[PDB]
Coordinates of C-alpha atoms in Angstrom, one line a residue:
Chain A
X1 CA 82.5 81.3 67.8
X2 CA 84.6 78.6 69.7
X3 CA 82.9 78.3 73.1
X4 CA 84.0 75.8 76.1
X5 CA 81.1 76.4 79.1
X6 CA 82.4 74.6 82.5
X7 CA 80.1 73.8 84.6
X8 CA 79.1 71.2 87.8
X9 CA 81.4 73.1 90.3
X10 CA 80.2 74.0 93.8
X11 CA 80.8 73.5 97.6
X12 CA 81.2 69.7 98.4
X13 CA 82.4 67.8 101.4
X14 CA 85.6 65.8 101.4
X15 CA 85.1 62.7 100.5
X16 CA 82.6 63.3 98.1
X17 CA 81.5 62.8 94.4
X18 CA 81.0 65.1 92.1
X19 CA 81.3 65.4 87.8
X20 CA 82.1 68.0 85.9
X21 CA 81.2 68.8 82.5
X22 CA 82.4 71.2 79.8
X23 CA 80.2 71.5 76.8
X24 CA 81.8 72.6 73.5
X25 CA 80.2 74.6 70.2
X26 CA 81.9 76.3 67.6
X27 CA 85.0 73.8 66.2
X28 CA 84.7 70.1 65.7
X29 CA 84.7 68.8 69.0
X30 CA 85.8 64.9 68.3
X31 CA 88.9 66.2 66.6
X32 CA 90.4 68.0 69.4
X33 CA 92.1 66.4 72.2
X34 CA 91.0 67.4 75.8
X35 CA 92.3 68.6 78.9
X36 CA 91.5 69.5 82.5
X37 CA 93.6 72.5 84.3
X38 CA 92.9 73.5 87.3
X39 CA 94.3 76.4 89.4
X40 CA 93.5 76.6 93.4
X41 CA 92.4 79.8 94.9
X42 CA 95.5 82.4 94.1
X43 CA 97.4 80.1 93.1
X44 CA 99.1 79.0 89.5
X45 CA 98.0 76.8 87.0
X46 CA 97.8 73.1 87.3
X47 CA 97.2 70.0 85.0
X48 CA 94.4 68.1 85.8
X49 CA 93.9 65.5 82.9
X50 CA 93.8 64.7 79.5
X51 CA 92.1 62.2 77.0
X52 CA 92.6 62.3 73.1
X53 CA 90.7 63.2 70.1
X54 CA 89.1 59.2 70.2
X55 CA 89.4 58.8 73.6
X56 CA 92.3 56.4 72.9
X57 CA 94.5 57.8 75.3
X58 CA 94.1 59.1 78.8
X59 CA 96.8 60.6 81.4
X60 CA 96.5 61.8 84.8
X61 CA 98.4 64.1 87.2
X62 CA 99.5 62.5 90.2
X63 CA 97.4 64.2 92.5
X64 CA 94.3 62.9 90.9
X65 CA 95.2 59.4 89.1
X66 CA 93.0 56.5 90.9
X67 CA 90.3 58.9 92.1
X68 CA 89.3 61.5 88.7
X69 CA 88.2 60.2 85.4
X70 CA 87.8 62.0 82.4
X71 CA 85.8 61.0 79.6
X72 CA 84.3 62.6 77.0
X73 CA 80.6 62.3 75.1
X74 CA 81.3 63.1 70.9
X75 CA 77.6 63.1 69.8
X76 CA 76.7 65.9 72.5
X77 CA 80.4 67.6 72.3
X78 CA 80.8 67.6 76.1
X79 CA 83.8 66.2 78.4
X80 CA 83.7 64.8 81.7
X81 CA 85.7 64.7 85.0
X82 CA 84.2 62.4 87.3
X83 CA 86.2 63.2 90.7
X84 CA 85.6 61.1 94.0
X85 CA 86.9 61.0 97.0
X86 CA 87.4 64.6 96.9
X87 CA 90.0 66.5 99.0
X88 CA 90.7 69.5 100.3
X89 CA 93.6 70.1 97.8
X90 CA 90.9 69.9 95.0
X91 CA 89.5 72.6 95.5
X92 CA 90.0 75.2 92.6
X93 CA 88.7 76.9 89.7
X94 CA 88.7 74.0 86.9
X95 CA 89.0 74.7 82.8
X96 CA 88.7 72.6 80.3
X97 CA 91.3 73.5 77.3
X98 CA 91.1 72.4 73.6
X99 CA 94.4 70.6 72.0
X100 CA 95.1 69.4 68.6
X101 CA 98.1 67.6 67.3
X102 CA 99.0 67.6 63.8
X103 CA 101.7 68.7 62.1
X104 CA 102.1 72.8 62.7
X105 CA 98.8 72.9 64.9
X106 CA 98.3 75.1 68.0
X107 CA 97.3 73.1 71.3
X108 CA 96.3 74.8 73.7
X109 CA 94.6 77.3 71.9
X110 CA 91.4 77.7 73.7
X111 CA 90.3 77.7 77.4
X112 CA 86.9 77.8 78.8
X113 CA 85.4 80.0 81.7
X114 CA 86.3 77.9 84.4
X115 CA 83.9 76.1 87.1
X116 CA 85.0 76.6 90.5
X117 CA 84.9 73.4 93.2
X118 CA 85.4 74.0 96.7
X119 CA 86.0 71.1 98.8
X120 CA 84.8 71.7 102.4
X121 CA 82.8 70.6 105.6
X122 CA 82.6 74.7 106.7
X123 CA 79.2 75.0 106.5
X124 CA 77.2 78.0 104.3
X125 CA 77.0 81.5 106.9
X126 CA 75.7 84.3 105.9
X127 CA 78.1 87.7 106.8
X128 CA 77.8 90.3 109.2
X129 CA 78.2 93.8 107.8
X130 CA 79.6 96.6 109.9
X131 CA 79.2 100.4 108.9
X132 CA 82.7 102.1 108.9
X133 CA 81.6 105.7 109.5
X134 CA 84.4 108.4 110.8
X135 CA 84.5 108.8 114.4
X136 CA 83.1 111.8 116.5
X137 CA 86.8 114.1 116.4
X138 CA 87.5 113.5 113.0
X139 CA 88.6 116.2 110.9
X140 CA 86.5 117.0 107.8
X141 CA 88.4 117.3 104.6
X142 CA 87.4 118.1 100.8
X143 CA 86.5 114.1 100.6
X144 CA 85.1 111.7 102.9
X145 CA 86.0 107.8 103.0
X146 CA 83.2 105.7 104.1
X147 CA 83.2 101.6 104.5
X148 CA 81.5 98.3 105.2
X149 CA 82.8 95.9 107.0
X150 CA 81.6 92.3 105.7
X151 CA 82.4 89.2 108.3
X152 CA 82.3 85.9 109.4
X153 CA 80.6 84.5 106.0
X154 CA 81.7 81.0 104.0
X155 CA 81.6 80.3 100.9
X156 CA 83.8 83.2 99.4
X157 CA 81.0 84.4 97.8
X158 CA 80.2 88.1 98.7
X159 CA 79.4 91.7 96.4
X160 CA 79.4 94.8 97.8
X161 CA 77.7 98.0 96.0
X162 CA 77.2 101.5 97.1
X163 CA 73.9 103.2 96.5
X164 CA 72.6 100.5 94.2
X165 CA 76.1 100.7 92.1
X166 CA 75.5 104.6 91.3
X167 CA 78.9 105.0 93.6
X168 CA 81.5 102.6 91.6
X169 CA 84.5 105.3 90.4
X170 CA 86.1 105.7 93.5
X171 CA 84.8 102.5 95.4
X172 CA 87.3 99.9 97.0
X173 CA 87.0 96.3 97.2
X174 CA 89.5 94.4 99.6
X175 CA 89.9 90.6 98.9
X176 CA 88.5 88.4 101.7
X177 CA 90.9 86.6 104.0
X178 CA 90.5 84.2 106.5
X179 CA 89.9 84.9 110.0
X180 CA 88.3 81.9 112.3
X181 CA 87.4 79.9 109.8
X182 CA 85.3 82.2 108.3
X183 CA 85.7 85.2 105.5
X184 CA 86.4 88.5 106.2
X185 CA 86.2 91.6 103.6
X186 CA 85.6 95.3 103.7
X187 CA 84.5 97.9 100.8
X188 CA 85.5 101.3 101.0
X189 CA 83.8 104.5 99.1
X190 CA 85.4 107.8 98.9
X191 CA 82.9 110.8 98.0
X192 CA 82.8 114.7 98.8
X193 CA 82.2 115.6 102.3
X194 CA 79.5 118.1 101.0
X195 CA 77.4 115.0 99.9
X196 CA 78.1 113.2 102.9
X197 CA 76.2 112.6 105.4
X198 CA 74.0 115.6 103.3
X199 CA 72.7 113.0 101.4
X200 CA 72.5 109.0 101.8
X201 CA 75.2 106.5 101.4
X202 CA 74.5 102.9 101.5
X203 CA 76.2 99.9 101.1
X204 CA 74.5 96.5 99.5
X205 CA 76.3 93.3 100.5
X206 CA 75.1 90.4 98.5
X207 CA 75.9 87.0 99.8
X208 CA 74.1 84.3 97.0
X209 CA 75.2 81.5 98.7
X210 CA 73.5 82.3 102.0
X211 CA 70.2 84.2 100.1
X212 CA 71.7 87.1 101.7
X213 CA 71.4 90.7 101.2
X214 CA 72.0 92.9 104.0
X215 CA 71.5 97.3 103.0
X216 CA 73.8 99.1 105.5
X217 CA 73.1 103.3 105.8
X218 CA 76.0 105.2 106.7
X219 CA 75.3 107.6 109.6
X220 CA 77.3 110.7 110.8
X221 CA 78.8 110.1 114.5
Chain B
X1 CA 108.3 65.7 86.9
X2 CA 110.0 68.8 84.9
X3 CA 109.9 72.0 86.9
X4 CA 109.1 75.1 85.9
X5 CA 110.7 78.1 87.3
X6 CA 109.5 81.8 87.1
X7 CA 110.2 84.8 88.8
X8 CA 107.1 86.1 90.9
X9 CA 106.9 89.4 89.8
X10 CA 108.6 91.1 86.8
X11 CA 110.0 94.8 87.6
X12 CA 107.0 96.9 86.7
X13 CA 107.0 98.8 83.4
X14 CA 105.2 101.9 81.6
X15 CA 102.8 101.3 78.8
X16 CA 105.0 101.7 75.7
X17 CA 108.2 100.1 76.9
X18 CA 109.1 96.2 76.4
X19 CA 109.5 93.7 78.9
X20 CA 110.7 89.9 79.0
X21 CA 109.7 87.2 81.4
X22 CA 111.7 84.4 81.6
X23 CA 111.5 80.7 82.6
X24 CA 113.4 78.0 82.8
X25 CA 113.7 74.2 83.1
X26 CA 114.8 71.5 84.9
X27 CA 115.2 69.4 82.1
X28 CA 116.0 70.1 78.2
X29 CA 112.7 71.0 76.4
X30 CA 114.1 71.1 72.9
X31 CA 113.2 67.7 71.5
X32 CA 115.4 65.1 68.4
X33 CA 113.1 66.0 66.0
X34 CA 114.1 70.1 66.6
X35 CA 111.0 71.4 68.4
X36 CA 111.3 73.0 71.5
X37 CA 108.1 72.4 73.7
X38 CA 107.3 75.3 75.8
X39 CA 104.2 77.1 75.5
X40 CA 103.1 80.6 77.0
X41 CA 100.1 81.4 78.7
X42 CA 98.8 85.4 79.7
X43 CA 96.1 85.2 82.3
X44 CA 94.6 88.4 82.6
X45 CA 93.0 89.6 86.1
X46 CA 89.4 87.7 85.9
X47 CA 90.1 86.0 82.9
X48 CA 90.8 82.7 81.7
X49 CA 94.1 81.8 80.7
X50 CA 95.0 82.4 76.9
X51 CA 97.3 81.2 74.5
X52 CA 100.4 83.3 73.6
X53 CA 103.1 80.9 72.3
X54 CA 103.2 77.9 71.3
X55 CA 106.7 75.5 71.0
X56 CA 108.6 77.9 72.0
X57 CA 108.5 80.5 69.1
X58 CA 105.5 80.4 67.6
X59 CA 102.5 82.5 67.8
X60 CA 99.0 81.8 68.6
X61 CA 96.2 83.3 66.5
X62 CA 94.7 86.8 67.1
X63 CA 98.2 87.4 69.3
X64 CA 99.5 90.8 68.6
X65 CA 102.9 91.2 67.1
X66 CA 104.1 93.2 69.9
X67 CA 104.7 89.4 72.0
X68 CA 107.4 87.1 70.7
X69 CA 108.8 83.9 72.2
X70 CA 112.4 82.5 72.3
X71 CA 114.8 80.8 74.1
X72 CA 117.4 77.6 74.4
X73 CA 116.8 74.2 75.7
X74 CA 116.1 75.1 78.9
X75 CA 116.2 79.1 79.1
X76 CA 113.2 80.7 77.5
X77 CA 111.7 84.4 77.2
X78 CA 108.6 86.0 76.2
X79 CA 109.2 89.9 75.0
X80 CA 106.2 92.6 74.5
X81 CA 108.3 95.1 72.5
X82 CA 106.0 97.8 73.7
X83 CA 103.5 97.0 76.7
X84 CA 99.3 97.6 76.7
X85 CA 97.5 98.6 79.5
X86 CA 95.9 95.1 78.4
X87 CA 99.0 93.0 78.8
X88 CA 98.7 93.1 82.6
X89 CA 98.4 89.8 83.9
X90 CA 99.9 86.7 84.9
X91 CA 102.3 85.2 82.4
X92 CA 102.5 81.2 82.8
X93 CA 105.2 79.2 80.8
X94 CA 104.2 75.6 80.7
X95 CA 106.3 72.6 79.3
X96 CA 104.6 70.0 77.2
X97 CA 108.1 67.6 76.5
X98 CA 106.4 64.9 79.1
X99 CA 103.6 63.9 81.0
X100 CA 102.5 65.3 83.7
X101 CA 102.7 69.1 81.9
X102 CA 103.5 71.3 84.1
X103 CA 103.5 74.9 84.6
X104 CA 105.5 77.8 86.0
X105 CA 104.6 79.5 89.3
X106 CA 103.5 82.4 87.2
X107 CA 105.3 86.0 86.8
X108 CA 102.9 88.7 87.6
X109 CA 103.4 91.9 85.2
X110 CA 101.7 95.0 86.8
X111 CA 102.2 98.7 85.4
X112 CA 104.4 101.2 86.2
X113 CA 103.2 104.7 87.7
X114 CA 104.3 107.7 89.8
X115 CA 104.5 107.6 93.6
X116 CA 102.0 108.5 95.1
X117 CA 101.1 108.7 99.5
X118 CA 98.0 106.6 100.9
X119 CA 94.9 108.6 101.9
X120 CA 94.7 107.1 105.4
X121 CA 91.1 106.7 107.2
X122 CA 90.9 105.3 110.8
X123 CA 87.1 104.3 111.7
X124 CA 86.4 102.7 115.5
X125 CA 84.0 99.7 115.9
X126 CA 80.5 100.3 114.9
X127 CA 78.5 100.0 118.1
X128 CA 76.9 97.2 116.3
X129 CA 79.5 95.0 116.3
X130 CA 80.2 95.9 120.3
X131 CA 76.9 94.5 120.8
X132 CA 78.4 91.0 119.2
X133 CA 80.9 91.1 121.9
X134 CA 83.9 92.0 118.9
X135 CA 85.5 94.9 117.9
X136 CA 87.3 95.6 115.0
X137 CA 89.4 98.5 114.4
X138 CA 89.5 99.1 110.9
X139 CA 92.3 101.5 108.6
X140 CA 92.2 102.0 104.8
X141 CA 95.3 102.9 103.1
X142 CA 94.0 104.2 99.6
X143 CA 95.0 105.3 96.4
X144 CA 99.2 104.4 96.8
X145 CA 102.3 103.4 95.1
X146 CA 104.5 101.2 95.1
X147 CA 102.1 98.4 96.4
X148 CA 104.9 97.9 99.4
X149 CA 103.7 99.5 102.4
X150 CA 103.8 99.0 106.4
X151 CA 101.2 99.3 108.8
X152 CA 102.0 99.6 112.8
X153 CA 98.7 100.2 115.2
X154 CA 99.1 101.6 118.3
X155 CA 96.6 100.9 121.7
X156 CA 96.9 103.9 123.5
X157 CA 100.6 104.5 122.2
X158 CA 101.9 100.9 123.3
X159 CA 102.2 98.9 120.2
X160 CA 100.2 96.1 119.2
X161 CA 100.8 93.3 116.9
X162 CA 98.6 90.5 117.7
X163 CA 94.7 90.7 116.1
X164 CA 96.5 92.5 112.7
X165 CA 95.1 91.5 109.0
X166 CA 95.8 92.8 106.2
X167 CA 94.5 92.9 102.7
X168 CA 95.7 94.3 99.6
X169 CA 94.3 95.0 96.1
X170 CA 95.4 94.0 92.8
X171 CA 97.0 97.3 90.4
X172 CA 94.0 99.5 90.1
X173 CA 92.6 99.0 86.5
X174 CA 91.7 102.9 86.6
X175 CA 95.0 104.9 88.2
X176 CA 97.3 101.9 88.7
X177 CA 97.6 102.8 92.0
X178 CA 97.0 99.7 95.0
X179 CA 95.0 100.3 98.2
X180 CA 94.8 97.9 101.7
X181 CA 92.9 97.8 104.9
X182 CA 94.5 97.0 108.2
X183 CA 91.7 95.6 110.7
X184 CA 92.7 95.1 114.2
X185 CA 90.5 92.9 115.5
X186 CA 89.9 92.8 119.9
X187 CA 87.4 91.7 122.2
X188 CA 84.8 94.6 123.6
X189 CA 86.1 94.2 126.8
X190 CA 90.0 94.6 125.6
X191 CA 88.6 97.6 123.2
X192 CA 86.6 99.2 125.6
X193 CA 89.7 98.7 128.4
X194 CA 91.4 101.5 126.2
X195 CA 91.2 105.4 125.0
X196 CA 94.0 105.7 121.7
X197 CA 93.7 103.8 118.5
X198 CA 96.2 104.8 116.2
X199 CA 97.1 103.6 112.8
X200 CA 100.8 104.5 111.4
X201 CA 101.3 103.9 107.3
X202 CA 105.0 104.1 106.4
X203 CA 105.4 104.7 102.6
X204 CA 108.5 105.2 100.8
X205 CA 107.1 108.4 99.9
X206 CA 108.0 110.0 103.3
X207 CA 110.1 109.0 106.0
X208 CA 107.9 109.9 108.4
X209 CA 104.5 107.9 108.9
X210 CA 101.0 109.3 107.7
X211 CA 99.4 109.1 111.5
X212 CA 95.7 108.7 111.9
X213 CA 94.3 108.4 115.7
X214 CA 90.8 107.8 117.6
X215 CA 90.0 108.7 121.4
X216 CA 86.7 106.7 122.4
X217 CA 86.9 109.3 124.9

């Protein structure tokens, strides 16, 4: 099958160097023209780049021209972006698309998995995680919700399971926003109020980045 | 550069019914030698984009039937004659008359469903995070539609707008319903200065607002 694997992404500072690779299997590599896209966190798509099948022509987006390069390796079917001086405003999930032109061909046709770059002096913090257990006077109904509050962590990097993923139909995950600086995001699970606190809820946060994993057990108040 | 315009979001739609997403540029895309060179991307939630349509018309292998392109110089459309829960997504036109290429802003396409009230749960700080000298007030608003919704909290019935965040979730993949947490977010010495939390969901569903309270006592 046709396969395009990103990879070299990562947290860097600004300012700095870093290359990108995309290797290719499955079509003949050297025939296709290449591209870079890019797309910053929730936001659209962006062209990044582009060199042609023989590496005889190469354009660049504005944003990047004098500071990317692409190039592109034939014999081992990989491409290249070589990005310095890196920026805040680079920082994104990049792919690396397929394009051939001949007469009634289909650019664009395939895109890869994406590496994602994130450009920033924030330094790697593992999260604090808060249970979110109903208070004393509330009222117990058919179902109970139960949550974790997940805080103060960087990069945007963070999973959050209930009871080792055996909870996951009626589970609740909130994306992360910014507060401080830092990343903020909660996970709420919903079961029977007959199973709960009867029998143990817990939530897993795993934070890669940090070599973090914090178990939270959800007690009655 | 040419500019692509989209609409943010498209009207959302029941599975089985047809839909069109247009765009438009600022510049002619239909080209002397009678090509027309807009393409059409899908982006599903999590995935990578993929190709639709290609010069304006034409499409792109293992593409169902069900998608078509057209359009004018500068107008175009993409139609799904009858919409797959699998055709939810973000649709991207992109131009490829010129150098730079450039894309559309994106029209999200979400599903249509029947209203439906949030389940509203108020939890107080976890005396863990008093000990950090914080205190966040956390409210989920589960299981609702449509996605637009309005939280007001209330500190011991006065109400209180600084210290508010809210996040909401995509179109549930499962029900289609969307769900967001409100977290109020004080110092221990503010929260502990104060007896009444109170979060207040207004829904189009009712006109009056789903009411869930806390005394620390």
């Amino acid at each position: 099958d046709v396969q395009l694997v990103e990879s070299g992404g990562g947290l860097v500072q600004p300012g700095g160097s870093r290359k990108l690779s995309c290797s290719a299997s499955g079509f003949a590599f050297s025939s296709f023209g290449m591209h870079w896209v890019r797309q910053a966190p929730e936001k659209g798509l962006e062209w990044v780049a582009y060199i042609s099948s023989g590496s005889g022509t190469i354009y660049y987006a504005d944003t990047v021209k004098g500071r990317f390069t692409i190039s592109r390796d034939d014999p081992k079917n990989t491409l290249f972006l070589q990005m310095t001086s890196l920026r805040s405003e680079d920082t994104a999930m990049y792919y690396c698309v397929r394009s051939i032109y001949y007469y009634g061909s289909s650019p664009f046709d395939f895109w890869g998995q994406g590496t994602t770059l994130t450009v920033s002096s924030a330094k790697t913090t593992p999260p604090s995680v808060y249970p979110l257990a109903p208070g004393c006077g509330d009222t117990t109904g058919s179902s109970v919700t139960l949550g974790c509050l997940v805080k103060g962590y960087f990069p945007e990097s963070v999973t959050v399971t209930w009871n080792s993923g055996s909870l996951s139909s009626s589970v609740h995950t909130f994306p992360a926003l910014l507060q401080s600086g830092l990343y903020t995001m909660s996970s709420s699970v919903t079961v029977p109020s007959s199973t709960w606190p009867s029998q143990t809820v817990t939530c897993s946060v795993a934070h890669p980045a940090s070599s973090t994993t914090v178990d939270k057990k959800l007690e009655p108040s | 550069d040419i500019v692509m315009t989209q609409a943010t979001s498209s009207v959302p739609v029941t599975p089985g019914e047809s839909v069109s997403i247009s765009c438009r540029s600022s510049k002619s895309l239909l080209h002397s030698n009678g090509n027309t060179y807009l393409y059409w991307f899908l982006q599903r939630p999590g995935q990578s984009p993929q190709l639709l349509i290609y010069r304006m018309s034409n499409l792109a292998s293992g593409v169902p039937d069900r998608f078509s392109g057209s359009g004018s110089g500068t107008a175009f459309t993409l139609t799904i004659s009858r919409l797959e829960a699998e055709d939810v997504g973000v649709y991207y036109c992109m131009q490829h008359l010129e150098y730079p290429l450039t894309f559309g802003a994106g029209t999200k396409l979400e599903l249509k469903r029947a209203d439906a009230a949030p389940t509203v749960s108020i939890f107080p700080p976890s005396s863990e995070q008093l000990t950090s000298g914080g205190a966040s007030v956390v409210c989920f608003l589960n299981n609702f539609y449509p996605k637009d919704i309005n939280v007001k909290w209330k500190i011991d019935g006065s109400e209180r707008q600084n210290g508010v965040l809210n996040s909401w979730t995509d179109q549930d993949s499962k029900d289609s319903t969307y769900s967001m947490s409100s977290t109020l977010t004080l110092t221990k010495d503010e929260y502990e200065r104060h007896n009444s939390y109170t979060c207040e969901a207004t829904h189009k569903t009712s006109t009056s607002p789903i009411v869930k309270s806390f005394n620390r006592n």
